[PDB]
Design a protein around this ligand. Structure first.
Ligand SMILES: *[C@@H]1O[C@H](CO)[C@@H](O[C@@H]2O[C@H](CO)[C@@H](O[C@@H]3O[C@H](CO)[C@@H](O)[C@H](O)[C@@H]3O)[C@H](O)[C@H]2NC(C)=O)[C@H](O)[C@H]1NC(C)=O
Ligand SMILES: *[C@@H]1O[C@H](CO)[C@@H](O[C@@H]2O[C@H](CO)[C@@H](O[C@@H]3O[C@H](CO)[C@@H](O)[C@H](O)[C@@H]3O)[C@H](O)[C@H]2NC(C)=O)[C@H](O)[C@H]1NC(C)=O
Lengths: 362, 362
């Protein structure tokens, strides 16, 4: 009936979205950290290749290790520039839009949860619309609904409730009078009329919209209107803009999964850096033919397809640094040493060794 | 009087906090980007030093430039690890806590803004408590209150309404009956009693708290109670935990201003990397007394205080590159070249030259 407490078929959907939005910061955390860890891994690969080039100068595989090292430096570099330029705003924008909307929902839902008179007359009713609900654990009567933001630790959010299309549970309502509103449980929050709703001496001046422009409450003796948020299109100035915004933001996310954070397993001449380095340094001739790139590569790699890039990488990994550099009975092989700070210093030990030579050498 | 619409004294404070908490994402953005830009600048300095050590390999000036280059690599490296480990969660946590609380406030304030009957009876009143206020632009009658989250673009923001100790304007209220509540404007949201408040056939079951546990609304014919939020202590399970949380998070922020993102202008032996590199590579005597560190440094730097570190740095920034390595009419000096990707390339050209000179020589 109109101007009556809300039955679970109204509020369970909003609970689901609130609890799903709760994971958006956790996701943002996960991604921002994933981007640095990946930048770090590319850096580590370039450090390992550089150190091999320093130890093994004179050989051709040393020149190969420089091309490997420059590619991974460039990866590690474009990763940090992607983090700055794209990923930071994206995850901040997702975290903020989702949290602001979660706040809006939660305030409304906790109003309803609190405006009750008896255990059978109130604003928040069970499915049956026989009793009011009570929070127990992080559920409002069994339904998982904490109505507060959980502590942010990294993890991937689900997209069940907010998908690529909009809010799936916030479909159109055909019969709000019956499916949302109880037959008799009283709620003044259910209308804007002075009799069984929010008006005191009169109906209010106009319709009130609640939950960030989700539900409209009229000053007339009528039932609620809810927006269908399941098939959204981007808009501005929309009454339920918060909903649009959290959707649009979540929808724009790529994660630390773009090109820059992914390794390339194609042919050597195609890898980030190779052809342009071969033209500039080795060939000293710009805009050359793919064959003459292929040729130079065969000198260092023994070919030009991914299996020779790995073979060099294997040499780089098997390559051991001095025990004087890494501890006691500790792992000395480069493939077994990780950590930018650690590897940056092993590199400076060998950059120092290379200076020593060239002062006796020239 | 009790069970009456709220006068500007009550709501202007919440407007101020909502609007301040609007800048928290903008700040988070600003910092996350500031951290990458600073990591980038340290990297650029290590790239410039490395290239000088390459272009001049085998000298003591190249040996000095290696120590400079390893310090800046280590900075750039610990910056990305600080970004990952500390700054990411910090700014995500600040953005989410603030946005969730801004959502909670805004929903309450927009309820009040909407529950009005006449232009003189309602829930949101002016200071005089004579008229109901209205939202024009991003202001509800003069006082700035957009009641929505602004688009996130970078900004450094000075906290005035939320600061180190809590929410400044959310003071203990001595006389809510008079300073908050009007004499006669009607608001059902002002109590939980069935006569002029939210109860329908009866008072509600208990007190309702609103704005994330800020204001308590009793089922009795009484005036509102508001929490003093201006001298907070961290707590758990608190009725107004959102407030505590946004405070604690904002209070924990350091910004991209920690050690790792700041340059060190102390003596050379004290700089990040120098003594440990001198012991490991040059001295090959791990655990050497600072005088013998001072000595080695004099060989490269011509001393051991900050003015010699800069002099090397001057040489480094002076050092020109090959004309072909730069754009049509672009500068060739290292001090005049910025951009990790750009400099990573110049470094690989010279790493290749060193490769070729070492074999041309050996
Ligand atoms: C992009 O691809 C490169 C090449 O695979 C990655 O570098 C490699 O990273 C792994 C660790 O992730 C290192 O593996 C080592 O293998 C040895 C032998 O199997 C094992 O004993 C060690 O425990 C370790 O697993 C490998 O040495 C290293 N290779 C090079 C050339 O540095 C890089 O991490 C990838 N980047 C990203 C963002 O994933
Ligand atoms: C930490 O300190 C180092 C050393 O000051 C910074 O590197 C230096 O960065 C500046 C640009 O920020 C470069 O300055 C150049 O100066 C010349 C001559 O005055 C001028 O013509 C150029 O337009 C440019 O301003 C300088 O070359 C560079 N020095 C080195 C050795 O790389 C570094 O940026 C600081 N780090 C952070 C995070 O601020």
């Amino acid at each position: 009936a109109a101007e009556k407490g809300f039955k679970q078929a109204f509020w369970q959907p909003l609970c689901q979205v609130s609890e799903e939005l709760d994971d958006q910061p956790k996701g943002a955390l996960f991604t921002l950290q994933a981007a640095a860890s990946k930048i770090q891994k590319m850096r580590d690969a370039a450090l390992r290749a550089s150190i091999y080039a320093e130890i093994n100068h004179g050989t051709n595989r040393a020149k190969a290790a420089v091309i490997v090292a420059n590619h991974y430096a460039m990866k590690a570099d474009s990763g940090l520039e992607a983090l700055k330029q794209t990923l930071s705003s994206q995850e901040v924008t997702a975290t903020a839009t989702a949290s602001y909307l979660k706040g809006r929902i939660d305030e409304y839902l906790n109003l309803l949860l609190q405006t009750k008179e008896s255990g059978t007359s109130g604003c928040m009713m069970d499915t049956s619309g026989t009793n009011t609900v009570t929070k127990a654990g992080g559920t409002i009567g069994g339904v998982p609904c904490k109505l507060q933001l959980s502590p942010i630790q990294p993890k991937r959010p689900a997209a069940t409730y907010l998908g690529k299309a909009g809010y799936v549970g916030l479909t159109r309502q055909a019969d709000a009078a019956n499916n949302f509103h109880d037959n008799d449980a009283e709620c003044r929050l259910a209308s804007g009329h002075n009799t069984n709703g929010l008006g005191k001496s009169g109906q209010l001046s106009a319709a009130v919209t609640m939950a960030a422009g989700y539900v409209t409450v009229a000053n007339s003796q009528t039932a609620v209107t809810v927006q269908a948020l399941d098939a959204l299109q981007e808009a501005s100035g929309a009454a339920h803009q918060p909903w649009i915004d959290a959707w649009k933001a979540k929808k724009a996310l790529t994660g630390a999964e773009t090109a820059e954070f992914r390794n390339e397993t194609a042919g050597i001449a195609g890898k980030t850096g190779v052809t342009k380095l071969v033209e500039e340094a080795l060939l000293k001739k710009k805009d050359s033919e793919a064959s003459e790139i292929q040729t130079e590569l065969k000198k260092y790699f023994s070919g030009h397809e991914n299996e020779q890039w790995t073979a060099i990488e294997k040499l780089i990994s098997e390559q051991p640094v001095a025990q004087n550099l890494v501890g006691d009975n500790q792992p000395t092989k480069l493939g077994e040493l990780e950590g930018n700070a650690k590897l940056t210093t092993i590199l400076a030990y060998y950059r120092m060794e290379t200076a020593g030579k060239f002062e006796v050498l020239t």
